[PDB]
Amino acid sequence: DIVLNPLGVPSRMNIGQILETHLGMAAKGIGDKINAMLKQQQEVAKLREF
Amino acid sequence: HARSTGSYSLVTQQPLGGKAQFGGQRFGEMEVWALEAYGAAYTLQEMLTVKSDDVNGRTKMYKNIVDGNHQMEPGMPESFNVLLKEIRSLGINIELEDE
Amino acid sequence: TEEFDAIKIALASPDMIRSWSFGEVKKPETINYRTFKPERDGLFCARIFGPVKDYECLCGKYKRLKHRGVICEKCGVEVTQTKVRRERMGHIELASPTAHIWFLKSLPSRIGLLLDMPLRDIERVLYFESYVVIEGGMTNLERQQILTEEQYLDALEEFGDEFDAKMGAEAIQALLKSMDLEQECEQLREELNETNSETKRKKLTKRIKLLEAFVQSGNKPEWMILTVLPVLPPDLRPLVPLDGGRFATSDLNDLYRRVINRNNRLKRLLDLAAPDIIVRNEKRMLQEAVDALLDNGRRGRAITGSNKRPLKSLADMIKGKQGRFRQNLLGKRVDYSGRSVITVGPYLRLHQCGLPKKMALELFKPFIYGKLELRGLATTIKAAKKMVEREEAVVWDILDEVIREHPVLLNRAPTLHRLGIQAFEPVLIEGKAIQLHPLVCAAYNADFDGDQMAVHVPLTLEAQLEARALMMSTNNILSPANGEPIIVPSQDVVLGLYYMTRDCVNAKGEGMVLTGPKEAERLYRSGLASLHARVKVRITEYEKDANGELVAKTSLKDTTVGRAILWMIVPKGLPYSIVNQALGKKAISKMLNTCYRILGLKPTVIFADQIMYTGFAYAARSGASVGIDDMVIPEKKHEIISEAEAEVAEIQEQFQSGLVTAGERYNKVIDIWAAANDRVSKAMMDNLQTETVINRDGQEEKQVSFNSIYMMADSGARGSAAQIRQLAGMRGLMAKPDGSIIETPITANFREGLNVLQYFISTHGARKGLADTALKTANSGYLTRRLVDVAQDLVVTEDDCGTHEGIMMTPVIEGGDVKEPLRDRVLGRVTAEDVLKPGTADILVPRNTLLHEQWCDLLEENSVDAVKVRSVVSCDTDFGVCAHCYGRDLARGHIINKGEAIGVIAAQSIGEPGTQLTMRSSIQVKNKGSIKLSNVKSVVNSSGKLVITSRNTELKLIDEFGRTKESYKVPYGAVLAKGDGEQVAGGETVANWDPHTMPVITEVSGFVRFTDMIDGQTITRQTDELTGLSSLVVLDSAERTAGGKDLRPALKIVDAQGNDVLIPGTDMPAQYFLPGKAIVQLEDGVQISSGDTLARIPQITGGLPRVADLFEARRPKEPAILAEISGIVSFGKETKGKRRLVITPVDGSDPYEEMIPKWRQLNVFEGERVERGDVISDGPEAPHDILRLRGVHAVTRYIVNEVQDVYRLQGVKINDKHIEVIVRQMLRKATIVNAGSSDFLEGEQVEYSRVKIANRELEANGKVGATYSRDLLGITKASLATESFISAASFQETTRVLTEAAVAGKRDELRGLKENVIVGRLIPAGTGYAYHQDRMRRRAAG
Amino acid sequence: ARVTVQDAVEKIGNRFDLVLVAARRARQMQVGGKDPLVPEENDKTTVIALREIEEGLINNQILDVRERQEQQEQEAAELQAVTAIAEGRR
DNA sequence: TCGGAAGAGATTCAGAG
RNA sequence: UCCGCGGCGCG
DNA sequence: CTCTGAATCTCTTCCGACGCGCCGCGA
Ligand SMILES: [Mg+2]
Ligand SMILES: [Zn+2]
Ligand SMILES: [Zn+2]
DSSP: OOOOSTTTHHTOOOHHHHHHHHHHHHHHHHHHHHHHHTTTTOOOHHHHOO | OEEESOOOSSOOOBBBBBBBTTTOOOOOOHHHHHHHHHHHHHHHHHHIIIIOOOTHHHHHHHHHHHHTTOOOOOOOOOHHHHHHHHHTTTEEEEEEEEE | OOOOOOOOOOEHHHOOOOOOOOBBBOOOOOOOOOSSSTTTTTTTTTTHOSSSTTTTTTSSSSGGGTTTOOOOOSSSBOOOTTTTHHHHHEEEEEEEEEEOHHHHHHSSSSHHOOOOOOOOHHHHHTTSSSSEEEEHHHHSOOOOOOOOOOHHHHHHHTTTTTEEOOHHHHHHHHHHHHHHHHHHHHHHHHHHHOOOOOOHHHHHHHHHHHHHHHHHOOGGGGGGGEEEEEETTTTTSEEEEEEGGEEEEHHHHOOOOOOOOHHHHHHHHHTTTTHHHHHHHHHHHHHHHHHHHHHHTTEEEEEBOSSSSSSSTTGOOOOOOTTEEEEEESOOOOOSSEEEEEEOOTSSSOOEEEEEEHHHHHHHHHHHHHHHHHHHOSSHHHHHHHHHTTTTTTTHHHHHHGGGGGEEEEEEEEEOSSGGGEEEEEEEEEEEEEEOOOHHHHHTTTTSOEEEEEEEESSSSSHHIIIIIIITTTTTBBOOOSSBOOOOOOOOOHHHHHHOOOOSSTTTTOOOESSSSHHHHHHTOOOOOTTOOOOEEEEEEEEESSSSOOEEEEEEEEEEEEHHHHHHHSSSSSOGGGTOOOOOHHHHHHHHHHHHHHHHHHHHHHHHHHHHHHHHHHHHHHHHOOTTSSOOOOTHHHHHHHHHHHHHHHHHHHTTOOOOOHHHHHHHHHHHHHHHHHHHHHHHHHHEEEEEESSSEEEEEEEOOOOHHHHHHTTTTSSSSHHHHHSSSSSSSOTTTTBBBOSSBBBSSSOOHHHHHHHHHHHHHHHHHHHHHHHHHHHHHHHHHHHHHHHOOOOEEEEOOOOOOOOOOOEEETTTEEEHHHHHTTTTOBBBBBBOOOTSSSEEEEESBBBOHHHHHHHHHOOOEEEOOOGGGGOOOSSEEEHHHOOOOEEEESSTTHHHHHHHHHHHHHHGGGGOOOOOOOOEEEESSSEEEEEEEEETTTSSSSEEOOOEEEEEETTTSOOOOEEEEEEOOEEEETTOOOOTTTTTTTEEEOOOOOOOEESOOEEEEEEOOOOTEEEEEEEOOOOOEEEEOOOTTSOOTHHHOOOOOOOEEOOOOOOOOOBBSSBBBBBEEEEOEEEEESOHHHHHHHEEEEOOOOOOOHHHHHHHHHHHTTTSSSOOOOOOSSEEOOOBBBBBSSEEEEEESOOOOOOOOEEEEEOOOOOOOOOOEOOOTTTTOSSSHHHHHHEEEHHHHHHHHHHHHHHHHHHHTTOOOOTTTTHHHHHHHTTEEEEEEEEETSOOOOEEEHHHHHHHHHHHHHHHHTOOOOOOOOOOOOOOHHHHSSSSHHHHHHSSOHHHHHHHHHHHTTTEEOOOOHHHHHHOOOOOHHHHHHHHHHHHHHHHOO | SSOHHHHHHHHHHHHHHHHHHHHHHHHHHTEEEEEEESOOTTTTTTHHHHHHHHHTSOOOOHHHHHHHHHHHHHHHHHHHHHHHHHHHHO
16 A cells, blocks of 8 residues: 655664564454454354454 | 735835745745856846846836747846935935946 | 946935935824824825825825826825835934934944043933033133033033033034044144054054045034934835724834924923923933934843834844845845645656646746737737636646746755756646656755755746756756766665676576677566576677777676666766676766766766666665564674673672772773674674575575665665664663763664663763754854855956966875875866976976866876965956866866856855764884985984984875875974884884973983082972982972072083083084973983983864864964074063063074963973974964964965865865865955055055055056055954945944944945845856946946 | 757857857847747747757857848848938939 | 853053163 | 734744 | 053953744734
8 A cells, every 4th residue: 555665764763663564464464364254254252262 | 836926015025925925935045145156147137136026127027928028127126225215214325326 | 227336325414314305204193093194294294205196186186197297286295106105205303413323332432432532421421411521721621521510510610601511412513513634633643653552553543544534535524413314215114004993003103203202392392491401301312212213222221112022223124134134135035936845756857847737827827828819819918817717728738838948946945055956847747746856856955755845937038048058957967066976876776776786696597698688688577587697798888999989899798687787778988897796876976977077968867867767667676675584683792792791790890899990990891891882793794794595506605695774785875884783783882961971881772672771861862963953054054154255256257367376285194094185186276387207307297287087197197296286365366266276167077167156156065064064102104115204303322213303393104106105293302213214114113202291302422510500499309209219300480499580400511521512513502401390310410422311391172163263263272382583592581471582583683572471381492493484382273373474375275174174074075176265265354564655554454456456556667566464354354344345234243334334435336246136237247247248348438 | 858058068168158149049039030040840949049059050250240231231221211212302 | 102252441460661 | 915023833 | 669561351242044834912
């Protein structure tokens, strides 16, 4: 959706933001999986344990 | 924001400032030095006299541009007359010479 | 209009001002509210100032132009245009005089010093506090005697009506009208020639010249006291309506009304015969009111309104940054302009900017009206307006037709240097963002985080021709500050090229052979080989042959696929070797520069555009990106930090045992932490920078890593070793707000989390830096304004002045390091003298040759060590500089054209980098060479060493070709282990000295005998019971007895017979005095060898302030004293704190005496033969004295050296020319030592041009010419010193310069740039220059 | 369109003199209406004058002699007109 | 109706008579 | 159609 | 022991970026 220039990061030393990006990819990851786990309409106990 | 022409101020006869008044940008003194660094005299003269402050020269310019002739006629910046009147009112006599 | 030639200024005679006015205003009324009509005789009385409306009589008698130019009978209003309201001035007439506050309060009281009166007395009379006296011969009371009230009554009750006494206004008016000018002139000059006191002499001279100015202007001095006061026209002081029917009154109207009210009150109290004290109080109030009107706040408490703010008087309308001069005369607002947020557009060619359609329509609406009527689509302006406001698409077609070749100007505030304004040929885009080409955006200093930019459209065709020829970005490739190109890529472009040219040891398709770069491109795009793969390729290149033809060559070369791809765009003529390496930013910069020198402008422009396109495309295809795994942390770091903390614990416990002082404990801890931090940084760089990968044959091999952040740093695209060090290595020490370093460094890097303490202490530096830049911006802007004001007059006015004078250029070397090679310092300058091939008499380079790159290369080949070049400071041109003295224009590459304004270029070139500046015992040879002594006298001893009596000698290490390599200053009396001319090698000790003492050297062997000394009076008998052996110490003037005062302790050397040996070369005995508090190791009567010593002696600021002080000609606080005369130093009388030194000339009959302080260490021992300009005592250096002693070249070299030193320390490059020009501008004022047969008075300040011309004509008719000395006034004073009083009034201290010009009767010819900019005619520079030449010929014809 | 004028500046030497000459040439081309000496290609009088001076067909002295001959033609027309008026009177 | 630098004026100290 | 003063705000 | 000049001290004045944008208020 949005393309950012990487060259700014080392010179501004906003390393933390890169970490934020990684967490984002992780977060939606779980969402995606749980979304699919909901879409297949399986037993709620499985998603509960997940 | 952009202004071809519009209102004009009372005392200085210069164009108004700011977006709300639909005024023009300010050709600050740094820009004047920039022009002086080039040999670009004519555009400087046009910037000061006709586009800005000549109460009749800009009318003539508007006429000629509408007519499609890019002539120019530099009069005198009215702010200069304002400065002269204020200096005279101060009690110091100042006047032009070799008319 | 009026075609005036000059402007004249003088005092206002009351009859003159009354002649101006079309009527008197006598009542305070302003405007009726029943009907919005002025009151008669009021501040807006139409009967005086004319009608409020065009040809409309106040009474309504007449309404149209049929009666144009007639006066209504019912009232005195005239049937005319409203414009007259702007013109006509009123007048008011006072029942009493009033001192004009300017002439009183100005820093020298012009009236006061004219009448020699103290300002306290003048104010005490003018403010109605005391009487003053005018004398009659029957009374002892003299004239101008101050008179208090009790003295007034005492005098009047015995001598009433015999003398006369008056209050300030009338008394001063009568006194000024009751004095003659010539009698006081002659008495003042006779007193001047008879008196001696320099204070008295300077006061007398300034009075003499003031009286001369008054007589030559013919202005009657009493006019300084007003009697009739002008009234500013109503329109300049408008009364403006408000919401609810209210009106904002301009403060000037209120001040006028107050003065009118006080005048009316005084006149009423006079005409009804009020008592004395009442009318005195009223007239004092009236005087105070006039003071408020002119210059409220100039004296005492300022007047204020209901808002509790001081009202802006007339003077405030011209003073200050809100003043009329700065706000409106310069820096006008302009029509036909727009502003918008900028945006990257990569698809643009170099010379075209993307301009939103709406702005284009608005700006060119007049042109659209014009063309639309011309093509017959619209008949009347109303039709055109309604059509364009409906956007009938034909208007869009017309709009696309109009702008096709119509350049526009783009400007970014602040316009730090002239690149800040550039010209572009527009292209129309939907949207609302102005699109720039990134390359020029780099030059703009702009970014894209939200910076706005303003666009102006030129109107006339001459203007747009100027914009195309001069300003178009395709012309501004070379910066004016230096010859290197300004159009240089950065960020993604450089990253892409770097990736494209980097090779790897093993890649897809390695080793194959390509018949041409096209096949390389095919194999890459088809995906059968990666860019990095190394391959052999057949390539053709070309070279500019001896005739100028591009002779071809074709060969096989080893390269990379990426390198061939890049080569394919390279234009013909450049060698292939330029590409065949990992291209960084600097490589691309030099590639563009070599393209521009080898080929023309247009191939370079096309090359730049192609570079930008290809770099962007291949960077995008690269997909370089930064990830958290990239910032590898060297695993050694934990071990190194544990080691460092172990050492910290060790030193801390060592202090716990009391073995060391706390300060050295701190120092040791700081040192070990710094060492550990450096070790960690080295480990991090080593681990990151290189990595191991398998080769083609199946073995591991090292290569430069493709780690992303490292690739970004190494390419030079962005970042630096410091930022990488902080990202991965430990970031190290940080400073407390006082600048002291915290003992515990920040150990965690940025990748790991910083604890709260580390973060908090780190914030100190962050807020320090932000405040630093916030403050620095203002100082930089101010400094630039100054430099511009000083240098704005200077314009190239002739081709060649014919001066053989010049300056000597040598490479700048300090401490054995060549800080600046000769090629940079001499490139583009004209030879003042013919350069000879070294070691021969053959002419290598002829005189008056512009040294371009080939000449510089030739100089390097022959190893020329010094050149002589023409300089701006040495040019003989009057009111300008010749083209040959200035030399090569950085922006164009050839000799500068006539008519260019250079001073402004120099001022901006100095100012712009200022934003970057910061603001809050033995000698070892470094390398091979030969030892030479610059200026030395040496004596050799029984130890085989050499000891020196020159106090300012320097070793210089010389190349075998005669070029210098190293140079180092050597202190007095240092010991040397080598003779002159010996060979040296790196690390070789050649000389030694004790820095902690000052020795005294005896040149000849003999037997010491104490002379002119007595123990306990001049010297005391130290026996160091607490230190060691016996010694003798000279008793200081506070410790010595009176018998020790005239007796100066000394030792003579005697032969074996006890006879006093003479100095080997002079009639002076070999006598060596012991200075105050001197220490000697040897007792009376011992032998000492030749060249042996016996004496023991007890022994930074920010860049921007330093440059400010240099250009302001600041006197340093501890000025070193240098020999004003060539002679022999000699001692003499003594007094408190100061020693009466004397220099006695060798042949001259005129000794000189100086009050040298004793607390400064003297470098003189009563035997030092000295010459003019030689250092007598060290310290900071005063530029004025340097100029006096060693001339213009010395001071210009000093200034340029200091400024270049600070800038090079920052790393910015500025050519010397821009400093030399400022120096020449500083150096205008001269002073006259004898007039010869000229009319000039002695001691007068005269502009150097005037005195030069006068002397030249005076000798042209054979008379004795005048003689002069030149004075280095600071740039502020030098700018105020100019004759163009208009420019001075524009700059600073407006009231002072206005008063000075007024009393002087000055006239300004309007010859500089600023004056013409004010007036609005063409400037006498650039394209305007030609217009003036014809004019001056007509003025010569007139 | 014109990427750069540098060749024309090389021909005239002084850049500012180039601006003046091109200005007067464009002035007379626009109001005087005298036709370009070279093909126009929907360009503007400015770049037209720049190309013309680039070709060396137009230069300060060339303008001088053209103005001289135009003045001579105008004065010849004036003299022939007044002679015709005199012949009408006679 | 706030600190710094420069200039001018005033006061004090040293040298010479 | 307007002189500002104060305030934040972005360069 | 006194007078004048020079030096030092005290007091007053000047300066301390360019550009846009909104809000309030206005005896
Ligand atoms: Mg920005
Ligand atoms: Zn009337
Ligand atoms: Zn010269």
